Amino acid sequence: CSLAPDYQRPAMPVPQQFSLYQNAGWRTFFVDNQVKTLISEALVNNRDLRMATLKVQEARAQYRLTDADRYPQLNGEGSGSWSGNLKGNTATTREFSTGLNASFDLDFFGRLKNMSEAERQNYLATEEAQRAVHILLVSNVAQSYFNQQLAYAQLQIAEETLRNYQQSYAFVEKQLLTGSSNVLALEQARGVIESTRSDIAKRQGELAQANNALQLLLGSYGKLPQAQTVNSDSLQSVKLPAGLSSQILLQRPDIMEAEHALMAANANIGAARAAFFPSISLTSGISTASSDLSSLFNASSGMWNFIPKIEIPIFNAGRNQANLDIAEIRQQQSVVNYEQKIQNAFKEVADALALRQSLNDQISAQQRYLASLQITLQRARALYQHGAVSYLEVLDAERSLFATRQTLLDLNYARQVNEISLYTALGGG
Amino acid sequence: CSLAPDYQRPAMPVPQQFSLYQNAGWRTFFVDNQVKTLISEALVNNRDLRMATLKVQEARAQYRLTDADRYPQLNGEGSGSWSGNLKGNTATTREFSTGLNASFDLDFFGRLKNMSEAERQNYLATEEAQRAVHILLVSNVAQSYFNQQLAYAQLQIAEETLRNYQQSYAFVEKQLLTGSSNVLALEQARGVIESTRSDIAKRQGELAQANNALQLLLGSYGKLPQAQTVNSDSLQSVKLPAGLSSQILLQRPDIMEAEHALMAANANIGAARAAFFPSISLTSGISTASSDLSSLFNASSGMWNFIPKIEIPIFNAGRNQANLDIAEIRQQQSVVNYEQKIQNAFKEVADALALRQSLNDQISAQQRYLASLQITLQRARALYQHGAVSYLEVLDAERSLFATRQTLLDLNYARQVNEISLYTALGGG
Amino acid sequence: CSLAPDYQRPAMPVPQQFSLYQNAGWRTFFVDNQVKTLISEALVNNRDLRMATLKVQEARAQYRLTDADRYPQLNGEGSGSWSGNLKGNTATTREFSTGLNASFDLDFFGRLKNMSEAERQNYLATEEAQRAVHILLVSNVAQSYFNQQLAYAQLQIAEETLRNYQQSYAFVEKQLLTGSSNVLALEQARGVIESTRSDIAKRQGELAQANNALQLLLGSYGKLPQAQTVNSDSLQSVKLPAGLSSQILLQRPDIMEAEHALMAANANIGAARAAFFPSISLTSGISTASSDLSSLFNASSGMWNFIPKIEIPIFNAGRNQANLDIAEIRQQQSVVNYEQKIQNAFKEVADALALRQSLNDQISAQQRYLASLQITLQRARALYQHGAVSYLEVLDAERSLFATRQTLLDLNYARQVNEISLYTALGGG
Ligand SMILES: CCCCCC(=O)O[C@@H](C)COC(=O)CCCC
Ligand SMILES: CCCCCC(=O)O[C@@H](C)COC(=O)CCCC
Ligand SMILES: CCCCCC(=O)O[C@@H](C)COC(=O)CCCC
């Protein structure tokens, strides 16, 4: 029988709602087929995921190892013994013996049963850990793909901007050969060409970095995607009901992992309690003994045996009690671990929801800012050509425009990352 | 008796002074009452601190478990034995036996005593670890509160700046309807409104983030503080004597933790040394034996027993010596661990003192910069209205002003964080 | 004999080349003598390296501990036994005994041999870990030195820039006292002086930070280097053949560490396999027994003994098989660990090579940008003095110039760091 306490799910340590559903699979969540191809390759070759899988196998074997202690054993033994007096009759006594021994712990109070159940729960927790590694890998690959696509997009506008600046310089140069511009404007036009070449070199380096990070996550080194067209339709951003229960968090593999670890600590309390009670064992066997080897296996030399035994703990100066205290305190730690995983998960979902609002409003404002900067640039150019303002008006407007284009690219990436984090924080596929 | 070496505090591995006192309690250090209310709530509900507390309880129980091995034990045993020949007289021999056994390890050379003292020192080290978690929690809550207050303050000036920009745009619009301004100026005024809306969205997102981080640290989800007025009087920044001894570092809980771990390794050397010496044990008991169950508890079937025993290690191919080497090397590692904690602590205090100077001088300079930018803006506006300069003068001055206001807010926050880190690095309350 | 499988190096989990040699020692790689002096001091006093060294000693002792189990043991035992009936003849029986016992496990199937070989491989892996700590320390000290030198260089140009701004302000002030300038220009000139004072305070703080980080790495607190002249000749940047084999990665200590850990897991499979086979042991000794103490050591009371013994596992409900499964799965994990270290190392080299290209091209572009900005500033000043443009032209050009000088310093530092990381990623000295 078992002395373990019944499992009771701890109270939810977070609010009932995220303020004021089930995730699609990742093959539906991701629309972009290039990112899905990368995800499937990583699932096959990624070494972190492979390690996590092997840890599940190890835990299953550790369970089987512990479960084996519940079953009878059968072992053999053989011995030869020579001995004699150091003085007097110095004649040698010789005896050979043989044993075939069966052994069985009856486990009436469920000590071995619960040590086995603890290890089975560690195995279950380890499968959930593997599932967490799995959904984090999907998330990480996707983010790295959008980072690569960000580098391509930044590189593209850097190169377009370089061409624009070269055309401007050519124009100022022509104007100068007619007294229409001065050497200050020429030099201002000349400088931004060089700063833009620096930006191109930066974005080329970011692309190479993005590629190397991708190959590490994939665990394979074949061709990587070229520049793609990526936008807010590249994923199916999650649509959550207004009054979404935080109970959806309990679906996350990291939370399920903590729950099984808690069930393991419950089983360990059971094993600790059983130490106070008597333990009953049974040994039974066949034996032989003979002073000579030839008649060692003769039935005439043989015996059978059957010995049931009981051990009874009476006073142990608090060994058993300290051991139980440890098991109960570790169970309390497992409860707290479970609460920490839920509070952390709640914070992840809450932050992603707030960042979602943030990024959509920044992106909308930056798009309108960009439109105004385009108009400013066009108006500055007209006024500059007619000698009504200095070339600093054109430079200032050009610089701001290019800066805002880069910022807008970065914000759209952040939005992709956040949509992926939200999906993953809700448990992924 | 004990073979452990006497404890000797390692030499201070850092300078005597921080270049060229006792901390108040945190209820005195913090003036702002809102942050103190948050700290008290976190002390009750924070899960990290609760875990640390449970680890102290576990360590206390592990100590009690190990101490129990020093005391006599009393246990009972019962057995039934059936056996017989496989050939010849196949008649079954039957014997029942009973044992009440006392056991005692005399521990003359202090092996069990020192294994117990090591575990007591682990318990003491674990209490200090709990105290470190405690003062770090106070520090972390306070920093998160000032981060929240920074978000409110950034949001406020972003909204004020938006209003300013809207008033400017309205003015340029009126001027345009009278031929007094041109479409370039109108568009420049229009654009910064949109960039400022992007900043508002950013600061709203930072506020929400700040709030979620706060609730995670608190472990509770009630109302959070609204915007407060926060300044350099919100804490009582520490006043340190010019020639402050680095010996104040030895008060830090992380350093006290390392010291007890070192005392534990000393005890372990004692336990390892005792392995070379004889061990004396004592067993004493009452027993019965009978071929039938009914006379099993008869005094006629009973005996008493008293068996003192000595085991003497002679040659073990260097098992004992390798084990001692391990204990001595681990003690040396504990010394190095202690030195690492002190060198790290010194670096934390030294950095905070340098950052203190840095931030006060940056803040003073930025305040004077801000005053100059205000004047520049006013002068640019006058000149612009009189047609003496382009609207770029107004835009440039407006942009710089808003940027410097944000920087100044960020510097004052950094100063708060640094004052809190210094206080905590000196051991906190 | 041994049942361990032969070691087979896993296939290279990365490409054959880095796209499309041996490192010099660090005393040749580093030219700057100041950084080499710092490296030598850290090698002596750094606490992390000292800890790593002590872990090698501990592992060597653990090996010696495990190896000792392969050798015969000799131990002594002494006993006194008093006993008697609880009823009837209540006369006390007394017996004293003595034992000198030799013991030897023959280890025919290599269980103890392989447990010893596993521990020797852990020792070898630990020496490699120490070597990794060593080359990382060299890298970290060097990077911290160049960070310190960056702070000095940033501080220097900040102070030079302050002087420039003060001279400009003085000039605008003189012009104002003659009606030649207006109060807007005066205030613009005044403001940048104050922003530059903020930058000086920042760079002084960065210098102090750099110094404290350096002393922590050194483990000593003597004088630190003053400002030096540092450039691309300060190190001998590695020159790699076009078709460099990725096999150079297998020289890295972290990879060699993983390989020995894999050899340890191979030995553990051998130990696990031996559990299925019989184990043969031998005990031999001298004993005495006497009812009185005086004749306890008499040869007349003595005996000699010789007892060889065999234990034979037959059925254990899968205990042995689960244990073997665990060893085989852990070996598979060790293979994966080895592959992870190589894939990570490849990524480090690949990134450094890409960053090298990036930084050289950014630095070249920024130098040309700087040259253009100098010319722009000179042209703006001339035009401003002649009343042809506003002072905003001078301010804009001054601000950009100072920003680009700081960026260029930061890029040259990044290049130093990257050259050091590449060298270290290739295995260091
Ligand atoms: C034998 C009828 C009892 C039914 C309850 C139940 O199965 O629990 C068992 C394990 C407890 O008793 C025990 O087995 C006691 C044995 C050692 C003294
Ligand atoms: C008996 C008088 C000695 C006083 C010193 C002291 O108390 O230390 C003890 C532990 C060492 O001797 C031992 O107990 C030796 C016992 C095993 C051979
Ligand atoms: C005795 C000749 C065999 C040569 C092969 C070799 O040395 O391997 C040994 C270890 C295996 O046999 C064993 O020692 C068997 C002993 C236990 C039943």
XYZ file of N, CA and C in Angstrom, chain C residues 206-278:
219
model
N 33.775 56.023 -17.539
C 34.109 54.818 -18.290
C 35.545 54.380 -18.024
N 36.445 55.343 -17.877
C 37.835 55.036 -17.543
C 37.926 54.356 -16.179
N 37.276 54.942 -15.178
C 37.279 54.355 -13.837
C 36.704 52.931 -13.834
N 35.605 52.732 -14.561
C 34.994 51.418 -14.744
C 35.966 50.440 -15.381
N 36.637 50.903 -16.435
C 37.606 50.081 -17.156
C 38.715 49.626 -16.215
N 39.181 50.554 -15.383
C 40.238 50.259 -14.421
C 39.814 49.219 -13.385
N 38.596 49.346 -12.877
C 38.125 48.411 -11.854
C 37.934 47.002 -12.420
N 37.486 46.922 -13.670
C 37.265 45.632 -14.328
C 38.609 44.951 -14.542
N 39.603 45.752 -14.900
C 40.974 45.283 -15.096
C 41.560 44.693 -13.812
N 41.408 45.415 -12.710
C 41.964 44.931 -11.455
C 41.295 43.639 -10.998
N 39.995 43.501 -11.263
C 39.293 42.254 -10.930
C 39.866 41.072 -11.711
N 40.102 41.275 -13.005
C 40.697 40.228 -13.831
C 42.140 39.920 -13.407
N 42.906 40.948 -13.039
C 44.301 40.737 -12.642
C 44.397 39.995 -11.316
N 43.458 40.255 -10.410
C 43.572 39.755 -9.048
C 44.636 40.499 -8.239
N 45.036 41.680 -8.711
C 46.014 42.511 -7.999
C 45.742 43.981 -8.259
N 46.256 44.842 -7.392
C 45.765 46.208 -7.366
C 46.874 47.267 -7.420
N 47.945 46.953 -8.140
C 49.030 47.895 -8.349
C 48.692 48.894 -9.441
N 49.692 49.634 -9.905
C 49.447 50.681 -10.893
C 48.934 50.124 -12.216
N 48.018 50.859 -12.839
C 47.503 50.471 -14.143
C 48.155 51.354 -15.200
N 48.171 50.897 -16.468
C 48.807 51.679 -17.535
C 48.153 53.049 -17.720
N 48.970 54.043 -18.031
C 48.483 55.349 -18.429
C 48.064 55.252 -19.888
N 47.599 56.364 -20.455
C 47.253 56.422 -21.877
C 48.422 55.983 -22.751
N 48.154 55.077 -23.688
C 49.172 54.595 -24.614
C 48.767 54.953 -26.025
N 49.676 54.758 -26.972
C 49.282 54.844 -28.368
C 49.013 53.423 -28.873
N 47.770 53.216 -29.299
C 47.267 51.918 -29.690
C 46.747 52.005 -31.124
N 47.072 51.008 -31.947
C 46.587 50.985 -33.328
C 46.507 49.550 -33.843
N 46.309 49.379 -35.147
C 46.177 48.032 -35.711
C 47.490 47.217 -35.657
N 48.613 47.872 -35.354
C 49.889 47.158 -35.186
C 50.094 46.646 -33.755
N 49.209 47.040 -32.842
C 49.271 46.574 -31.451
C 49.120 45.054 -31.293
N 48.520 44.394 -32.288
C 48.490 42.922 -32.334
C 48.914 42.489 -33.719
N 49.296 41.221 -33.846
C 49.602 40.633 -35.146
C 48.395 39.843 -35.619
N 47.438 40.537 -36.231
C 46.176 39.916 -36.638
C 46.421 38.648 -37.471
N 45.677 37.583 -37.185
C 45.981 36.286 -37.788
C 45.816 36.282 -39.303
N 46.764 35.638 -39.972
C 46.712 35.479 -41.423
C 46.399 34.022 -41.752
N 45.182 33.790 -42.223
C 44.680 32.442 -42.459
C 44.720 32.092 -43.948
N 45.161 30.861 -44.271
C 45.141 30.388 -45.662
C 43.713 30.386 -46.207
N 43.563 30.639 -47.504
C 42.255 30.698 -48.156
C 41.378 29.463 -47.903
N 41.969 28.275 -48.004
C 41.213 27.041 -47.846
C 41.405 26.362 -46.495
N 41.410 27.163 -45.432
C 41.653 26.670 -44.079
C 40.654 25.592 -43.642
N 41.176 24.420 -43.313
C 40.345 23.325 -42.825
C 39.737 23.638 -41.457
N 38.465 23.291 -41.272
C 37.806 23.453 -39.978
C 38.355 22.464 -38.941
N 39.204 21.540 -39.383
C 39.887 20.633 -38.461
C 40.729 21.401 -37.416
N 41.100 22.647 -37.703
C 41.813 23.458 -36.703
C 40.985 23.639 -35.409
N 39.659 23.571 -35.523
C 38.785 23.666 -34.344
C 39.058 22.566 -33.315
N 39.470 21.392 -33.791
C 39.693 20.235 -32.916
C 40.890 20.436 -31.978
N 41.632 21.515 -32.205
C 42.725 21.934 -31.330
C 42.242 22.728 -30.112
N 41.049 23.307 -30.192
C 40.512 24.094 -29.084
C 40.370 23.248 -27.821
N 40.767 23.806 -26.680
C 40.647 23.087 -25.411
C 39.203 22.721 -25.068
N 38.218 23.558 -25.387
C 36.840 23.155 -25.087
C 36.411 21.922 -25.896
N 36.917 21.788 -27.123
C 36.625 20.608 -27.927
C 37.383 19.383 -27.395
N 38.642 19.576 -27.008
C 39.421 18.475 -26.444
C 38.803 18.001 -25.137
N 38.226 18.936 -24.384
C 37.523 18.593 -23.148
C 36.348 17.650 -23.433
N 35.525 18.011 -24.416
C 34.361 17.214 -24.801
C 34.770 15.827 -25.296
N 35.921 15.743 -25.959
C 36.382 14.459 -26.485
C 36.755 13.505 -25.360
N 37.469 14.008 -24.353
C 37.830 13.173 -23.204
C 36.595 12.776 -22.401
N 35.603 13.658 -22.326
C 34.366 13.311 -21.631
C 33.678 12.160 -22.373
N 33.811 12.163 -23.696
C 33.256 11.090 -24.517
C 34.008 9.774 -24.276
N 35.330 9.849 -24.136
C 36.112 8.651 -23.823
C 35.763 8.108 -22.444
N 35.438 9.003 -21.518
C 34.975 8.604 -20.191
C 33.655 7.834 -20.269
N 32.748 8.275 -21.141
C 31.459 7.596 -21.284
C 31.616 6.222 -21.941
N 32.606 6.092 -22.824
C 32.970 4.788 -23.384
C 33.407 3.807 -22.302
N 34.279 4.272 -21.410
C 34.746 3.451 -20.293
C 33.559 3.055 -19.416
N 32.621 3.982 -19.209
C 31.443 3.679 -18.399
C 30.545 2.606 -19.009
N 30.516 2.520 -20.335
C 29.794 1.431 -20.983
C 30.463 0.098 -20.639
N 31.796 0.090 -20.650
C 32.550 -1.094 -20.260
C 32.248 -1.572 -18.847
N 32.158 -0.631 -17.911
C 31.865 -0.958 -16.520
C 30.459 -1.524 -16.396
N 29.522 -0.926 -17.127
C 28.132 -1.382 -17.117
C 27.979 -2.789 -17.707
N 28.715 -3.078 -18.780
C 28.654 -4.412 -19.392
C 29.169 -5.504 -18.449
N 30.187 -5.175 -17.657
C 30.814 -6.150 -16.762
C 29.884 -6.607 -15.637
N 28.829 -5.839 -15.391
C 27.886 -6.176 -14.323
C 27.117 -7.462 -14.617
N 27.028 -7.824 -15.895
C 26.302 -9.032 -16.294
C 27.109 -10.301 -16.029
N 28.416 -10.135 -15.850
C 29.331 -11.269 -15.778
C 29.687 -11.603 -14.340
N 30.169 -12.840 -14.100
C 30.555 -13.209 -12.734
C 31.686 -12.336 -12.216
